[PDB]
mmCIF file of C-alpha atoms (C1' of nucleotides) in Angstrom:
data_model
loop_
_atom_site.group_PDB
_atom_site.id
_atom_site.type_symbol
_atom_site.label_atom_id
_atom_site.label_comp_id
_atom_site.label_asym_id
_atom_site.label_seq_id
_atom_site.Cartn_x
_atom_site.Cartn_y
_atom_site.Cartn_z
ATOM 1 C CA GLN A 1373 -36.241 25.611 -93.899
ATOM 2 C CA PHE A 1374 -33.677 24.560 -96.513
ATOM 3 C CA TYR A 1375 -32.127 22.226 -93.924
ATOM 4 C CA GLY A 1376 -35.458 21.357 -92.304
ATOM 5 C CA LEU A 1377 -34.578 23.051 -89.009
ATOM 6 C CA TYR A 1378 -37.405 24.753 -87.123
ATOM 7 C CA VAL A 1379 -36.887 27.811 -84.910
ATOM 8 C CA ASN A 1380 -39.758 29.512 -83.079
ATOM 9 C CA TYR A 1381 -41.048 32.790 -84.488
ATOM 10 C CA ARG A 1382 -40.350 34.932 -81.408
ATOM 11 C CA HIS A 1383 -36.577 34.320 -81.452
ATOM 12 C CA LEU A 1384 -36.441 35.432 -85.097
ATOM 13 C CA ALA A 1385 -38.807 38.394 -84.820
ATOM 14 C CA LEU A 1386 -36.771 39.668 -81.866
ATOM 15 C CA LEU A 1387 -33.608 39.831 -84.001
ATOM 16 C CA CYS A 1388 -35.538 41.362 -86.913
ATOM 17 C CA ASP A 1389 -36.805 44.060 -84.544
ATOM 18 C CA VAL A 1390 -33.339 44.625 -83.026
ATOM 19 C CA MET A 1391 -31.780 45.361 -86.428
ATOM 20 C CA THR A 1392 -34.622 47.626 -87.608
ATOM 21 C CA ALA A 1393 -34.973 49.562 -84.344
ATOM 22 C CA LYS A 1394 -32.856 52.597 -85.269
ATOM 23 C CA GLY A 1395 -34.591 53.249 -88.604
ATOM 24 C CA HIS A 1396 -31.743 52.010 -90.796
ATOM 25 C CA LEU A 1397 -29.949 48.675 -91.177
ATOM 26 C CA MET A 1398 -28.022 48.058 -87.949
ATOM 27 C CA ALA A 1399 -25.798 45.142 -88.921
ATOM 28 C CA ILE A 1400 -24.300 42.719 -86.412
ATOM 29 C CA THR A 1401 -20.687 43.768 -87.026
ATOM 30 C CA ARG A 1402 -18.324 46.191 -85.364
ATOM 31 C CA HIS A 1403 -19.924 48.862 -87.578
ATOM 32 C CA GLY A 1404 -23.456 48.391 -86.243
ATOM 33 C CA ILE A 1405 -23.018 47.364 -82.620
ATOM 34 C CA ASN A 1406 -20.264 49.836 -81.718
ATOM 35 C CA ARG A 1407 -22.185 52.677 -83.405
ATOM 36 C CA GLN A 1408 -25.116 52.340 -80.984
ATOM 37 C CA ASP A 1409 -25.937 54.463 -77.922
ATOM 38 C CA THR A 1410 -24.929 51.841 -75.348
ATOM 39 C CA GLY A 1411 -22.229 52.145 -72.717
ATOM 40 C CA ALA A 1412 -18.495 52.218 -73.261
ATOM 41 C CA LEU A 1413 -17.780 49.025 -71.317
ATOM 42 C CA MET A 1414 -20.484 47.156 -73.236
ATOM 43 C CA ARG A 1415 -19.092 48.231 -76.616
ATOM 44 C CA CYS A 1416 -15.436 47.676 -75.701
ATOM 45 C CA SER A 1417 -16.179 44.123 -74.544
ATOM 46 C CA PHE A 1418 -17.106 43.004 -78.069
ATOM 47 C CA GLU A 1419 -14.577 44.402 -80.571
ATOM 48 C CA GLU A 1420 -12.137 47.332 -80.927
ATOM 49 C CA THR A 1421 -11.631 47.681 -77.180
ATOM 50 C "C1'" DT X 1 -25.799 105.685 -122.489
ATOM 51 C "C1'" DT X 2 -28.242 101.153 -120.664
ATOM 52 C "C1'" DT X 3 -29.479 96.118 -121.441
ATOM 53 C "C1'" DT X 4 -28.511 91.521 -122.907
ATOM 54 C "C1'" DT X 5 -25.229 87.983 -123.889
ATOM 55 C "C1'" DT X 6 -20.887 85.642 -123.659
ATOM 56 C "C1'" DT X 7 -17.163 84.336 -120.685
ATOM 57 C "C1'" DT X 8 -15.150 83.218 -116.368
ATOM 58 C "C1'" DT X 9 -14.634 81.384 -111.892
ATOM 59 C "C1'" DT X 10 -15.994 79.274 -108.077
ATOM 60 C "C1'" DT X 11 -18.929 75.474 -105.882
ATOM 61 C "C1'" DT X 12 -20.704 71.621 -104.666
ATOM 62 C "C1'" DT X 13 -21.242 67.054 -105.725
ATOM 63 C "C1'" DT X 14 -20.013 62.442 -107.974
ATOM 64 C "C1'" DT X 15 -17.649 58.626 -108.793
ATOM 65 C "C1'" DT X 16 -14.124 55.841 -108.864
ATOM 66 C "C1'" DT X 17 -9.760 54.482 -106.842
ATOM 67 C "C1'" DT X 18 -6.719 53.831 -103.103
ATOM 68 C "C1'" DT X 19 -5.613 53.266 -98.387
ATOM 69 C "C1'" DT X 20 -6.443 51.730 -93.883
ATOM 70 C "C1'" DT X 21 -7.967 48.860 -90.384
ATOM 71 C "C1'" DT X 22 -9.930 45.234 -88.043
ATOM 72 C "C1'" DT X 23 -11.367 40.529 -87.729
ATOM 73 C "C1'" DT X 24 -10.790 35.352 -87.847
ATOM 74 C "C1'" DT X 25 -15.366 28.683 -82.439
ATOM 75 C "C1'" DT X 26 -14.931 26.739 -77.149
ATOM 76 C "C1'" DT X 27 -12.342 23.895 -73.637
ATOM 77 C "C1'" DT X 28 -8.394 20.529 -72.214
ATOM 78 C "C1'" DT X 29 -3.546 17.638 -71.862
ATOM 79 C "C1'" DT X 30 1.635 16.729 -72.733
ATOM 80 C "C1'" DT X 31 6.758 18.005 -74.116
ATOM 81 C "C1'" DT X 32 11.121 21.135 -75.664
ATOM 82 C "C1'" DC X 33 13.852 25.641 -75.917
ATOM 83 C "C1'" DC X 34 15.194 30.024 -74.367
ATOM 84 C "C1'" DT X 35 14.872 33.604 -70.490
ATOM 85 C "C1'" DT X 36 22.112 37.099 -75.379
ATOM 86 C "C1'" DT X 37 26.177 38.730 -78.008
ATOM 87 C "C1'" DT X 38 29.801 40.599 -80.394
ATOM 88 C "C1'" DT X 39 31.986 45.425 -79.966
ATOM 89 C "C1'" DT X 40 34.176 48.998 -77.843
ATOM 90 C "C1'" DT X 41 36.215 51.034 -73.859
ATOM 91 C "C1'" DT X 42 38.611 50.504 -69.425
ATOM 92 C "C1'" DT X 43 41.655 48.386 -66.197
ATOM 93 C "C1'" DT X 44 45.163 45.275 -64.858
ATOM 94 C "C1'" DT X 45 49.314 42.647 -66.019
ATOM 95 C "C1'" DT X 46 53.748 41.611 -68.004
ATOM 96 C "C1'" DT X 47 57.973 42.688 -70.182
ATOM 97 C "C1'" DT X 48 61.594 45.913 -71.318
ATOM 98 C "C1'" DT X 49 64.888 49.794 -70.607
ATOM 99 C "C1'" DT X 50 68.113 53.151 -68.240
#
DNA sequence: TTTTTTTTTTTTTTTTTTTTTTTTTTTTTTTTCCTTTTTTTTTTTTTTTT
């Protein structure tokens, strides 16, 4: 809202629920995505293959 | 002669510093240059001598 851009609430609440799903702060880095419980090929496709 | 009281020695954490490691928008089009090199060993050749 500083730049006057409007994004719908669902697309923001989905991200806010993705980060707070595990009970702590799951950042969107290589330290939060690669520390999840997903598959090996999914995690190696992003960073630190 | 036993109990408290001081000393000691680990014990686990804390905190700060240092080190390490990993990352850095998407697509497309043209040229240029290099894709060895000097060193050491081996083999052949040429000249000389008896």
